Design an enzyme around this catalytic site. Sequence first.
Site, PDB file in Angstrom:
ATOM      1  N   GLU B  73       0.824  -1.194   0.000  1.00  0.00           N
ATOM      2  CA  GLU B  73       0.000   0.000   0.000  1.00  0.00           C
ATOM      3  C   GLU B  73       0.870   1.260   0.000  1.00  0.00           C
ATOM      4  O   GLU B  73       0.615   2.172  -0.791  1.00  0.00           O
ATOM      5  CB  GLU B  73      -0.971  -0.022   1.193  1.00  0.00           C
ATOM      6  CG  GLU B  73      -2.095  -1.050   1.056  1.00  0.00           C
ATOM      7  CD  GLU B  73      -1.676  -2.493   1.350  1.00  0.00           C
ATOM      8  OE1 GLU B  73      -0.565  -2.733   1.873  1.00  0.00           O
ATOM      9  OE2 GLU B  73      -2.482  -3.395   1.077  1.00  0.00           O
ATOM     10  N   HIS B 100      10.171  14.351  10.655  1.00  0.00           N
ATOM     11  CA  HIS B 100      11.374  14.315   9.815  1.00  0.00           C
ATOM     12  C   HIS B 100      11.092  14.282   8.317  1.00  0.00           C
ATOM     13  O   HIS B 100      11.826  14.886   7.535  1.00  0.00           O
ATOM     14  CB  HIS B 100      12.224  13.088  10.148  1.00  0.00           C
ATOM     15  CG  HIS B 100      12.941  13.177  11.456  1.00  0.00           C
ATOM     16  ND1 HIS B 100      14.086  12.458  11.716  1.00  0.00           N
ATOM     17  CD2 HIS B 100      12.686  13.898  12.573  1.00  0.00           C
ATOM     18  CE1 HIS B 100      14.502  12.726  12.941  1.00  0.00           C
ATOM     19  NE2 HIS B 100      13.670  13.597  13.481  1.00  0.00           N
TER      20      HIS B 100
END
EC number: 5.3.1.6
Lengths: 156, 156
Positions: B73, B100
């Site tokens: 996915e 991040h």
Amino acid sequence: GMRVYLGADHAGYELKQRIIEHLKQTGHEPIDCGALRYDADDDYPAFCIAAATRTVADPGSLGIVLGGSGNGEQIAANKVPGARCALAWSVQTAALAREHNNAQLIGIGGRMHTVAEALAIVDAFVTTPWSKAQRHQRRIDILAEYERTHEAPPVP
Amino acid sequence: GMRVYLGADHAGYELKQRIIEHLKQTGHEPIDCGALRYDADDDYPAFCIAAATRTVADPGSLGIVLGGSGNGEQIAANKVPGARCALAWSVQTAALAREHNNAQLIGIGGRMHTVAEALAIVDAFVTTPWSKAQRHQRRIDILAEYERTHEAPPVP
């Protein structure tokens, strides 16, 4: 015996070194795409793109990209045309990456595992066969056609 | 991340429905990209491509794709231009994905977690701010430039 292209920034550098050594000792052929030294400020994308690019261009090879979490690194690798890079955080996800997704690459987060746990993930990745089951190839083909045209396939 | 686009085939369908209800209850606006019903033989790539396309096209939104492991996915979602889809397997990786990587999407592997653990991953994902730190943006910019041009950035 499997050829494996490895890439890592500073956060995955030490783990990359250990994996290269481990792959050599278990009868595989590691190829280091960088980083070649520790540099605390260096940037992961170039190393991950290099590993994934070389993997796709050398059919039958695998690749592993290493960072802190591995997520930036797998994202980068997945931008390479023809690359499929799973995030492997367990022996089970490493094996399923091969078995179901035919992933040529995995990302591993060096800060997420012990060295022992990381090397077991690597082992599963480099020894688990692609199942070749119809549904898995069908889904790979759908994504590949999307990559070819960037025309989003209709939902049912 | 108040509008949240969700996609899953049969393997992530039940968990997706649980997450949609949880997101409603926590003040977000979940948008179901499909599957809208359980169909054992449907294929995830179209739902993941739809979720990632719609997320990237919608400023300030996020997206979640659900599968067995989540790996197929996230790979699919990452083929969408501009998309950054992490695989979130813990509260820490869901948070780092935002902080991040500025990931607009995560994949979750419903078979790898209890419902409670999965909802906690979702909570971390939708509440953790993007850091906007220089080095993180620099890395995203390098990847975005590679997506634009397919010229692999040089390795130091």
